């Protein structure tokens, strides 16, 4: 029950596992089993889903015994689970995606008020943790509001953002 | 293929048939039994499997004639049957079964039934 | 062959550069192929790698050591098929490589010219910063 | 129809016809067109011009008569999946070009033919045209043996002819939780044991055991 | 002239996916392409 | 970093005929 | 079946038991393979039509009633069995090899009798 996590936007490689060494035929499907990939001799075969244009395999580890799944611009929408049927084995991942930005983009003062934005996928609740470089380390759940934003306060945060013990980290825009 | 590789399904007919008539066919099925790239490099691969059939064959009679057997298609062999490997009646299995379904049976068993004809021809051969 | 040649003078490279094939082209490369291959009718494969928009095997070409002014039978420069077809990169690419905007073919085209016929705003405003700073 | 599991998206499914579909094709002698270009890139215009006529193909199927044999086709399929439920075809989804387009060889010459106008169809249960597919020789082609890529030699400038018959088809189901309805069907392989096994289908090699054991009421010696 | 010979009572399983006739013939076929067409520019990828 | 280095091999090719034809399989003597 | 000649007497007599179950290049060398199966073959056949006048035809182990002069052993054959291989054995009787087979023969035909 292996779960990854995204940056909305960067790219995450989901992996099978093989042990025959032969480039034995596999797919990927979801939850609702739409095919995303498969393997029908030695080509690649992208699945008639909403996400088409964007997935990707690395073709020379075929050979080897992995099979990678490489999405690239994620999104929201695609945080759900994903199947591997190498051989007869259903080994299943789980794909977390959100996003953690700010509202005001530029126009910032000195001795202001600073809210934050996080858009999580519907079924989870993760947590933000904070970290400055002035030693704020916020502690929060997932909304998070900061009530002073000073000159010394310039430079971008560290907001690490931790479920099922697994965490990412981001930037955030100040300026001031 | 020809010839000996033939004969090999030559008796493979009729093998859904009753198990005491493919027995007396046998004697039957037995008597029944009968430029340049061509001759040069093509000519040596059908010789290649003429002999293969060849060698199958001794190879086979070979080890029918282990347990005193050698010519004879149908032969009585004095090895007493144990009531483990069938506990059957003779009469089922030569009015109702089939050969298939036999070696089935008995393919966890012909291992040492061949082991124990050779321990028998042995003990013969010793008195 | 590497560098083999048919009755209209197009070469392997050339098809590589026309198709895409990022890894054929390297291949071609380290094999040994000619980077500045001529044909019958002038093209070279930096016109076909800048005109559809593959700025991978231009990068590949133009650090090898091909003409970045290459003049084919119509005198157009590898930037006026850049900016014909909409490829801004591939225009600030030839700029960072060293082309010359003020360069003419048979008709009299500038590569601003060929810009502001198309209604192409942007390749014109940063080829003109380029000649600014020229 | 042949599948290792129906209502499982991920195998194929092969299909025999009873009747053979004719297709021909051919490759053009020379150019036809010859288009005049003032405006500018006329050098790249021309250039492009003559280096995809040299490659450039067409392929002719008979419209009646394909859609005659795939009218059999969705009958056959209706069989394994309800009556009035609505099934129908769609073009290929994506991928490789030999999986994206149709990919087969006249005189070591291949052509990737576009199948996406043959496969548009539409059914509703209880309710001399001859169809041109374009196809291009590309030289560059992913090998079906291997892993990797490979480029061929140019292609001759004789015109290449082939006439030949349409056997079989290989289908992949989209397998979808959207109300069992609009069960739709796109054209997959590339997979050549899946071509073999279209054919070695009936075919089975088994070897000989003539030695055989039984009990009788005989005696020996 | 070939031998066919027609079985009279008999019910076999005939399961053609696991055959493995195919994964002799597959192997004869890339044995014939490799030997026959011979590309000009061939590429593979090696992992180590 | 996996090391996936691909290898490229350049050989001679002359043109050739392509023509399938039909083969049958033989199995060997005693199958 | 010149192999395994290392084992001695006792232990070859209980493994014979488990015995018992570029063109032109190419096809001159091809054909010497098929002189050498065929002439096997032909040799294994020849023996086995010498064997059949002795009546152990198609038995690798047969046990015979011919009278054996202890000259020819000249040997107590108690410890030739466990120490002793074929090949110097064969060795030992080479001199004495055409008269016992002279009396296998005539030995069989009062068997007939
Ligand atoms: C499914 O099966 C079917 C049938 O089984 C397949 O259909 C077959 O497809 C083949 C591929 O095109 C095709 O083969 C061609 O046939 C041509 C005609 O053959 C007849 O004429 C010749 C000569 O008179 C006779 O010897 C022969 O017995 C026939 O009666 C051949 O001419 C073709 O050979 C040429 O092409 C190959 C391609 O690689 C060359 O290697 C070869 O050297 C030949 O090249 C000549 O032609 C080309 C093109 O014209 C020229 O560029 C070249 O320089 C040569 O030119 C000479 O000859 C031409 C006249 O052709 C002349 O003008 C010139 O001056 C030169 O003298 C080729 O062999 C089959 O006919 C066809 N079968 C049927 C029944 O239609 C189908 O493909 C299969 N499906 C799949 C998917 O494979
Ligand atoms: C052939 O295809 C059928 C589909 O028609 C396959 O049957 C499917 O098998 C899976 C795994 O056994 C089933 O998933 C299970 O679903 C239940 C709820 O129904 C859930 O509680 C389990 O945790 C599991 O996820 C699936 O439902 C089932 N589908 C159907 C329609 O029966 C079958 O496995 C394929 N292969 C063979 C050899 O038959
Ligand atoms: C199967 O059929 C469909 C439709 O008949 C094909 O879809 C077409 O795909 C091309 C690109 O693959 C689309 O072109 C795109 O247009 C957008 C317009 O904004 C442009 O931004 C893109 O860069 C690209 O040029 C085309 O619009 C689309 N057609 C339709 C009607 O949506 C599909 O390619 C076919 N698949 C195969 C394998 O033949
Ligand atoms: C196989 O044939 C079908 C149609 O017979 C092709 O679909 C057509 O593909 C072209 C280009 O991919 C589409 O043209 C597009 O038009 C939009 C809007 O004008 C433009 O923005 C795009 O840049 C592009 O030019 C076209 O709409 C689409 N459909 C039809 C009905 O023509 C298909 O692409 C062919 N397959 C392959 C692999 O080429
Ligand atoms: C038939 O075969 C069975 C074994 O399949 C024999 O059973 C053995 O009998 C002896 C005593 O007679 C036991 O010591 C063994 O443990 C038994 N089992 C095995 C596996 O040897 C049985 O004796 C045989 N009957 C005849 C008449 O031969
Ligand atoms: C769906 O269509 C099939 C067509 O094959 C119907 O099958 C027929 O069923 C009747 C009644 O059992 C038989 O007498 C016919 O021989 C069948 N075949 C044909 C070709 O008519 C089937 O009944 C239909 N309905 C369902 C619910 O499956
Ligand atoms: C696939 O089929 C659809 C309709 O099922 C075609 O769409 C129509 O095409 C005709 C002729 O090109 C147009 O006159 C219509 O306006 C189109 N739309 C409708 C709603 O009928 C489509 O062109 C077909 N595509 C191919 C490649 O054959
Ligand atoms: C395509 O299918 C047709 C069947 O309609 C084939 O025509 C038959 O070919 C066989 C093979 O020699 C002949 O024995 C028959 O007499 C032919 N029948 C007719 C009605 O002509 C045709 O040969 C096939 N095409 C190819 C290339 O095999
Ligand atoms: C096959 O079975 C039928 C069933 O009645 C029987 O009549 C027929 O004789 C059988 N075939 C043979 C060769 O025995
Ligand atoms: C076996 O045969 C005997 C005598 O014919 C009979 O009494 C017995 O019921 C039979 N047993 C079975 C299992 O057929
Ligand atoms: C013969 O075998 C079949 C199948 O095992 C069985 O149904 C039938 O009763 C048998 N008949 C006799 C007479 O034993
Ligand atoms: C014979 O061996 C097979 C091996 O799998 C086993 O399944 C079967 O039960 C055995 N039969 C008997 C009668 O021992
Ligand atoms: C090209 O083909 C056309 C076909 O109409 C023909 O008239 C013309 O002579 C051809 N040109 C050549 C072979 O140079
Ligand atoms: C294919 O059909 C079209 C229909 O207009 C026709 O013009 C063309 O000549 C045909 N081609 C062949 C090779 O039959
Ligand atoms: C090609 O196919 C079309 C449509 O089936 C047919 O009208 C034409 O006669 C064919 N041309 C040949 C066989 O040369
Ligand atoms: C194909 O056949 C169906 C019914 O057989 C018919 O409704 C449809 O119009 C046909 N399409 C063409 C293009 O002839
Ligand atoms: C049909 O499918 C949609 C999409 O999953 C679903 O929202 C809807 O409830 C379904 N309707 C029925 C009747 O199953
Ligand atoms: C030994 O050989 C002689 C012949 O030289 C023979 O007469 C005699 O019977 C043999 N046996 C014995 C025990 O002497
Ligand atoms: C042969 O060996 C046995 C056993 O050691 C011995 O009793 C006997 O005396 C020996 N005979 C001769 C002639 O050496
Ligand atoms: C066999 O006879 C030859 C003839 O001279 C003799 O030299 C040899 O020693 C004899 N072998 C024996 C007695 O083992």
Same mark, same amino acid.
């Given at each position: /029950?292996?779960?990854?996590?995204?940056?909305?936007?960067?790219?995450?490689?989901?992996?099978?596992?093989?042990?025959?060494? /032969?480039?034995?035929?596999?797919?990927? /499907?979801?939850?609702?089993?739409?095919?995303?990939?498969?393997?029908?001799?030695?080509?690649?075969?992208?699945?008639?889903?909403? $996400?088409?244009?964007?997935?990707?395999?690395?073709?020379?580890?075929?050979?080897?015994?992995?099979?990678?799944?490489?999405? /690239?611009?994620?999104?929201?929408?695609?945080?759900?689970?994903?199947?591997?049927?190498?051989?007869?084995?259903?080994?299943?991942?789980?794909?977390?995606?959100?996003?953690?930005?700010?509202?005001?983009?530029?126009?910032?003062?000195?001795?202001?008020?600073? &809210? $934050? &934005?996080?858009?999580?996928?519907?079924?989870?609740?993760?947590?933000?943790?904070?970290?400055?470089?002035?030693?704020?380390?916020?502690?929060?759940?997932?909304?998070?509001?900061?009530?002073?934003?000073?000159?010394?306060?310039?430079? &971008?945060?560290?907001? &690490?953002?931790?479920?099922?013990?697994?965490?990412?980290?981001?930037?955030?825009?100040?300026?001031? | 293929?020809?010839?000996?590789?033939?004969?090999?399904?030559?008796?493979?007919?009729?093998?859904?048939?009753?198990?005491?008539?493919?027995?007396?066919?046998?004697?039957?099925?037995?008597?029944?039994?009968?430029?340049?790239?061509?001759?040069?490099?093509?000519?040596?691969?059908?010789?290649?499997?003429?002999?293969?059939?060849?060698?199958?064959?001794?190879?086979?009679?070979?080890?029918?004639?282990?347990?005193?057997?050698?010519?004879?298609?149908?032969?009585?062999?004095?090895?007493?049957?144990?009531?483990?490997?069938?506990?059957?009646?003779?009469?089922?299995?030569?009015?109702?079964?089939?050969?298939?379904?036999?070696?089935?049976?008995?393919?966890?068993?012909?291992?040492?039934?061949?082991?124990?004809?050779?321990?028998?021809?042995?003990?013969?051969?010793?008195? | 062959?590497?560098?083999?040649?048919?009755?209209?003078?197009?070469?392997?490279?050339?098809?590589?550069?026309?198709?895409?094939?990022?890894?054929?082209?390297?291949?071609?490369?380290?094999?040994?192929?000619?980077?500045?291959?001529?044909?019958?009718?002038?093209?070279?494969?930096?016109?076909?790698?800048?005109?559809?928009?593959?700025?991978?095997?231009?990068?590949?070409?133009?650090?090898?050591?091909?003409?970045?002014?290459?003049?084919?039978?119509?005198?157009?420069?590898?930037?006026?098929?850049?900016?014909?077809?909409?490829?801004?990169?591939?225009?600030?690419?030839?700029?960072?490589?060293?082309?010359?905007?003020?360069?003419?073919?048979?008709?009299?085209?500038?590569?601003?010219?060929?810009?502001?016929?198309?209604?192409?705003?942007?390749?014109?405003?940063?080829?003109?910063?380029?000649?600014?700073?020229? | 129809? +042949?599948?290792?599991?129906?209502?499982?998206?991920?195998?194929?499914?092969?299909?025999?016809?009873?009747?053979?579909?004719?297709?021909?094709?051919?490759?053009?002698?020379?150019?036809? @067109?010859?288009?005049?270009?003032?405006?500018?890139?006329?050098?790249?215009?021309?250039?492009?011009?003559?280096?995809?006529?040299?490659?450039?193909?067409?392929?002719?199927?008979?419209?009646?008569?394909?859609?005659?044999?795939?009218?059999?086709?969705?009958?056959?399929?209706?069989?394994?999946?309800?009556?009035?439920?609505?099934?129908?075809?769609?073009?290929?989804?994506?991928?490789?070009?030999?999986?994206?387009?149709?990919?087969?060889?006249?005189?070591?010459?291949?052509?990737?033919?576009?199948?996406?106008?043959?496969?548009?169809?539409?059914?509703?249960?209880?309710?001399?045209?001859?169809?041109?597919?374009?196809? @291009?020789?590309?030289?560059?082609?992913?090998?079906?043996?291997?892993?990797?890529?490979?480029?061929?030699?140019?292609?001759?400038?004789?015109?290449?002819?082939?006439?030949?018959?349409?056997?079989?088809?290989?289908?992949?189901?989209?397998?979808?939780?959207?109300?069992?309805?609009?069960?739709?069907?796109?054209?997959?392989?590339?997979?050549?044991?899946?071509?073999?096994?279209?054919?070695?289908?009936?075919?089975?090699?088994?070897?000989?055991?003539?030695?055989?054991?039984?009990?009788?009421?005989?005696? +020996?010696? | 002239?070939?031998?066919?010979?027609?079985? *009279?009572?008999?019910? *076999? *399983?005939?399961?053609?996916?696991?055959?493995?006739?195919? *994964?002799?013939?597959?192997?004869?076929?890339?044995?014939?392409?490799?030997?026959?067409?011979?590309?000009?520019?061939?590429?593979?990828?090696?992992?180590? | 970093?996996?090391? #996936?280095?691909?290898?490229?091999?350049?050989?001679? #090719?002359?043109?050739?005929?392509?023509?399938?034809?039909?083969?049958?399989? #033989?199995?060997?003597?005693?199958?």
């Amino acid at each position: /029950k292996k779960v990854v996590l995204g940056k909305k936007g960067d790219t995450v490689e989901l992996t099978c596992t093989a042990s025959q060494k /032969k480039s034995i035929q596999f797919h990927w /499907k979801n939850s609702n089993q739409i095919k995303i990939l498969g393997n029908q001799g030695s080509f690649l075969t992208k699945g008639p889903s909403k $996400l088409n244009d964007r997935a990707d395999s690395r073709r020379s580890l075929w050979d080897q015994g992995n099979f990678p799944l490489i999405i /690239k611009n994620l999104k929201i929408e695609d945080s759900d689970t994903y199947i591997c049927e190498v051989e007869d084995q259903k080994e299943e991942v789980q794909l977390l995606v959100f996003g953690l930005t700010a509202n005001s983009d530029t126009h910032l003062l000195q001795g202001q008020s600073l &809210t $934050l &934005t996080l858009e999580s996928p519907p079924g989870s609740s993760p947590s933000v943790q904070c970290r400055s470089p002035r030693g704020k380390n916020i502690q929060g759940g997932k909304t998070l509001s900061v009530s002073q934003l000073e000159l010394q306060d310039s430079g &971008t945060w560290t907001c &690490t953002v931790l479920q099922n013990q697994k965490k990412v980290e981001f930037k955030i825009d100040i300026v001031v | 293929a020809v010839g000996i590789g033939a004969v090999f399904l030559g008796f493979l007919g009729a093998a859904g048939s009753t198990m005491g008539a493919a027995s007396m066919t046998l004697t039957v099925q037995a008597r029944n039994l009968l430029h340049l790239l061509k001759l040069t490099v093509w000519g040596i691969k059908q010789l290649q499997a003429r002999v293969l059939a060849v060698e199958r064959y001794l190879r086979d009679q070979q080890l029918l004639g282990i347990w005193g057997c050698s010519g004879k298609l149908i032969c009585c062999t004095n090895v007493p049957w144990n009531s483990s490997w069938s506990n059957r009646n003779l009469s089922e299995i030569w009015d109702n079964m089939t050969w298939l379904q036999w070696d089935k049976e008995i393919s966890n068993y012909t291992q040492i039934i061949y082991g124990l004809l050779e321990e028998s021809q042995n003990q013969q051969e010793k008195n | 062959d590497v560098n083999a040649v048919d009755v209209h003078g197009i070469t392997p490279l050339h098809l590589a550069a026309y198709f895409g094939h990022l890894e054929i082209v390297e291949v071609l490369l380290k094999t040994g192929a000619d980077v500045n291959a001529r044909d019958n009718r002038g093209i070279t494969p930096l016109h076909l790698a800048a005109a559809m928009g593959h700025l991978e095997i231009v990068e590949v070409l133009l650090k090898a050591g091909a003409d970045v002014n290459a003049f084919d039978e119509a005198g157009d420069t590898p930037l006026h098929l850049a900016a014909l077809k909409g490829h801004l990169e591939i225009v600030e690419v030839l700029l960072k490589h060293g082309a010359d905007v003020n360069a003419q073919d048979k008709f009299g085209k500038t590569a601003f010219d060929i810009s502001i016929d198309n209604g192409n705003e942007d390749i014109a405003e940063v080829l003109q910063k380029a000649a600014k700073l020229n | 129809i +042949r599948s290792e599991n129906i209502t499982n998206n991920a195998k194929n499914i092969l299909v025999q016809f009873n009747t053979p579909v004719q297709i021909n094709c051919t490759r053009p002698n020379n150019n036809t @067109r010859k288009s005049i270009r003032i405006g500018p890139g006329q050098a790249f215009y021309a250039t492009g011009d003559i280096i995809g006529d040299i490659r450039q193909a067409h392929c002719n199927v008979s419209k009646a008569t394909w859609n005659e044999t795939l009218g059999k086709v969705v009958k056959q399929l209706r069989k394994h999946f309800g009556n009035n439920t609505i099934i129908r075809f769609a073009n290929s989804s994506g991928g490789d070009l030999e999986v994206t387009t149709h990919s087969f060889n006249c005189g070591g010459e291949f052509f990737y033919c576009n199948t996406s106008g043959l496969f548009n169809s539409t059914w509703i249960s209880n309710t001399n045209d001859s169809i041109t597919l374009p196809c @291009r020789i590309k030289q560059i082609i992913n090998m079906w043996q291997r892993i990797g890529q490979a480029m061929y030699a140019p292609p001759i400038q004789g015109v290449i002819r082939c006439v030949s018959n349409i056997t079989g088809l290989i289908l992949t189901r989209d397998g979808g939780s959207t109300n069992s309805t609009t069960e739709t069907f796109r054209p997959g392989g590339g997979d050549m044991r899946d071509n073999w096994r279209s054919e070695l289908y009936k075919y089975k090699v088994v070897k000989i055991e003539p030695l055989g054991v039984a009990p009788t009421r005989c005696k +020996r010696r | 002239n070939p031998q066919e010979i027609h079985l *009279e009572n008999v019910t *076999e *399983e005939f399961n053609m996916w696991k055959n493995n006739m195919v *994964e002799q013939m597959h192997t004869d076929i890339i044995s014939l392409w490799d030997q026959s067409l011979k590309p000009c520019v061939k590429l593979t990828p090696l992992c180590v | 970093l996996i090391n #996936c280095n691909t290898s490229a091999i350049t050989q001679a #090719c002359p043109k050739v005929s392509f023509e399938p034809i039909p083969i049958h399989y #033989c199995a060997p003597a005693g199958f």
